[model samples]
Target: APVWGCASTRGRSAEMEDASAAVPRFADVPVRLLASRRDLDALGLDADALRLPAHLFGVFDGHGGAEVANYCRERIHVVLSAALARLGKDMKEHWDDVFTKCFQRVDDEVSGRVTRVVGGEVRSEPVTAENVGSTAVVALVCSSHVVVANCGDSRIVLCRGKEPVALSIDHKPDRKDERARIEAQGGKVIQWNGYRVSGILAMSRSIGDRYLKPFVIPKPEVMVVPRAKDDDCLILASDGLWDVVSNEEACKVARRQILLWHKNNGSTDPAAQAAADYLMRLALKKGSEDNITVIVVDL
Candidate 1:
């Protein structure tokens, strides 16, 4: 089967300030790029892979500024690839550990780079000047299991046959447990502007909350789900895409596209691309003000 890649730029130039890049399948794996215009303030870059010997996938949601997000987009895959190679024998049993270390390593690198660029330390303390941080959602698909690790709100959802089964949770601040944890750690979850948990920022967990890092570690929460026979596809998307569309709505669209692909060309090419394109348009139609990005992978 031929891999299909599709991308859509933000509708208006005014909202295109956030820049994004994707090197899909590094060497032979498929890759796609989706970036915002050069004038916006937000930063969002997410990456995922389906054929990486181990089926590794990831999404990075940058906050404070786009520096951290852009930094991770450039260096994360290289770091994770090396970490995976180092785990020669324990690749399966210790996959979670390897993935966690890769995330931390990226965080450390971001801190150092950001500090050097700004002529200050990027320590765990709060620095109000253009604070730079990112939330990461990563996953690895093995022969029998699929492991998912998340730090912020970018999510991964699996479609078993045709039903949606969310693989990663959105770290919202209003969630009882999340709110309690933040308050207990002496971190206030005040409403930003008006939205309580806008763009997964109000939560307690994230990769680069330098200020919150002192009290609350931003390490990711890892979960492993065995791939069953019913598993058919997985969707990894930034909040922009999810903010406007429902899971069921997205799935229905995907199913239709997949069917259409098999129908017209006796293949899945056009259908897969159509599904991704439709989702992007849907987000815009639904009034999503942020950069909308979506990746749909047939498993």
Candidate 2:
């Protein structure tokens, strides 16, 4: 039961290719398994526990088309919910494994549409193409932990006790490890408009981009951190915002806006909607040329 707000826009881009989600109580865990957990014990909540799941937040930035990003925004949470349910007693310890496999499964689903000929006549086919892909950055925030899975350039930032901490790293082609990986895979990281994989894709990893196989991977890097009492808010956004705004600036804006909204409205609820809208507007005003999407979860 986190309070979250979301905002999205095409901005100066030709198409609206960004998608976002703010889902509260998105997952469910077995009460018996978590009843005696150390974290629960620390929180002093043993009896009043059953709906022990995380609030899900995500940002997807599409490059070639919106299909991939839209699909991810719609499906990833559902897939994760199922994965958590299936994990049952092992979910807490197996978060990394679950997320890794989840990303691979989603990638498979997106890249599975291939051209094939059947029974003499040619069957209809679409490869999702070499250019079609999307960057994914998803965060699962519960009472005890914040788990993040990142692929491509979108990001997740956490504000804790007035400090901004990045929970996910952008998967840019020029990143040291990513460049080495692409080079080892026989793919060149060419510096055209920017360091691009094979001079085409700007990111080293993404959800689709079937033609960039072995070069642009879909594997997501996952991180898990325990929650703290000083936690302030969570920010999730596309490169549209990060390219024009620093994490520190974004966090400052989020915190200020949330507080201002509460003060103006005289309500106890955090004004996450205002904060999210303000961030998106700030990105646009700062000359971000891509689709902008921002989500703010007030903890």
Candidate 3:
């Protein structure tokens, strides 16, 4: 009954960089999200706009600053909605083409904007993707299906029955396919802190990082899942949680909290804020060394 399921956003420095949005009854379905900002990244969505596909959500993790991450946050949906609107066709049918192009367009547009701006206003130099980069994981919940798009290490886990369903994979350089792609392009993956592209960024695919261009791609891996009543909990979080917490463990903790809230409050309509808060606190206790942001969607 509460809009966007009330959320209890947390911050360590009180300067918590995380951002999020929710719409309880938009297009007739509840929409809730959490975007934890470890660096300068952004997540969550404009409830009014992203519901084009019933419900849309995205998480962006930024490095080298929040420029690109926040950029994706504020603009990705605009391009997504614009293109989809113009086509006026089947959403799921054209989703792949639309989503893929949207990523490419946003990346290139960032490139273009940088190039153009450099030529103007104060002997400026074009901003290259190298200056900033961000990882992304987006979700669209439909009446009968749920679609997920992933790039980088961010994750989305769904719980059904007693276990957890992994909806996305970490795009690490060591991955067979990713490593092969990098080698084929004359790029290198080395161990600095961990496997990284050209001894630099860790993820193989991302929205920006012009310096790692061509090697580091922006093409997100899209996955589609059939929705059913069995679906219980949907969890989205940055590497901050997944880095140290296993998917199964995270799922169990979340589901437990949600159920606990229902038991204590006599209502389960919206208890994700507590679940999310619990996850962050757990992650911190478990030694999550990164900025943590979490969103738990209860079904």
Candidate 4:
């Protein structure tokens, strides 16, 4: 099992558009698969394997509005759980395919032009705004592997021993491949303060942004690595933190703070919450202009 904590603040931004989620033990496997051991055998899975803890953590950074980010914070985990059950054995061998499909499914929900929910009733409200979008970065931790899916600028980093290993890449428009893709799609990357896709969005890909369709995609780059003895901790944060703090500094602080918190506080669980809060304060002190959110997962 993994111990994790999260913190968020709007900082100097007018609206709080950042969101985070931390699920220490998420077991949403289908009941049908557990009805009989024969069923598990058919899927090449056993009860012991299914009993292993599956954890989820994510950070969402919204642009234009918070609707898209809020939606992902509420729905992505459910979608991932269902996909895991539906894919069964394939999840172990083909996580990238599963993650890509899950992101696409969530993007489609927003593209439908309807909220699909209203005050607990199934009434549809038209969501006509095409400018609202959100960057999503999710980290799934299981017994054997840590899988990361990145859709936009939000990032995830892994601390292995004393070194920082970046698990996700920011999808800025100025990147060589990103610029080429934008041009291929008949979109222009223009510099207005920062490089913007189609002279509008700073990111090359994201969820929602119906107006930026085809150019700003929701396809996530998935990364999978087996858990190792040297693994220390994992951090997920919005660009607000990365914009001000270096990855090496964040890792160093989290590593030392988590240990100190445990030693001084005499708590059984790690001080993940303390570390997250420290990072949030650091970002604010560094004059971050956007909403900041951070999640620390002790592995």
- Misplaced by over 4 Å in model 3 are 1-53, 89-93, 113-129, 266-270
Give the Å error, residue 146, model 4. 0.7
- lDDT of the candidates, in the order given: 0.60, 0.83, 0.69, 0.83
lDDT by residue (tens digit), candidate 2, 1-299: 57888888888788998988777788875443334566676877663345576778899998888888987888788888888787664554566678877887777777764333346864334435656889999998877678889999999999997899999888989999999998887779999999899888889989988888989888888887777899889999999999999999999999999999878996113489899899999999899999999988898
Candidate 4 lDDT over 131-204, as tens digits, reads 88899999988766788999999999999987999999899999899899989988899999899987889999
- Rank by TM-score, highest first: 4, 2, 3, 1
Model 1: runs farther than 4 Å from truth? Answer: 1-8, 11-52, 89-93, 113-130, 193-200, 215-217, 267-270
Off by over 4 Å in 2: 29-51, 89-93, 113-127, 267-270
Per-residue lDDT for 1-299 in model 1, tens only?
A: 32333444555424332333333433222111111222122333222222234544556666666666666666666776676554442233355576578777766655553332234643542333335676677655555566677777787777787888787788777667777776776665667753243233555566665645543345677776777888766677777777888787777777677667777776224666677788888888888877665666666
Using all chains and alpha carbons, the TM-scores for the candidates as numbered come to 0.74, 0.87, 0.79, 0.87
The local lDDT score (0 to 100) that residue 189 gets in candidate 3 is 90
State how far residue 127 of model 1 sits from its true place (Å): 14
Task: Output the worst ten-in-a-row residue range by lDDT, candidate 2.
Answer: 29-38
* Per-residue alpha-carbon lDDT of candidate 3 for residues 1-299, written as tens digits (9 for 90 to 100): 32112232333433333333332222322122211122213444443233333555667777776677776777676666666565442334455676788898778766663332223553224334465877888776656567788888888899986689899999999999999999999999998999998888889998878878899988988777777779887888878778788989998998898889878896224567788888888888887666676767775
C-alpha-based local distance difference test score of model 4: 0.83
Q: Name the regions of candidate 4 deviating beyond 4 angstroms.
A: 28-51, 89-93, 113-128, 267-270
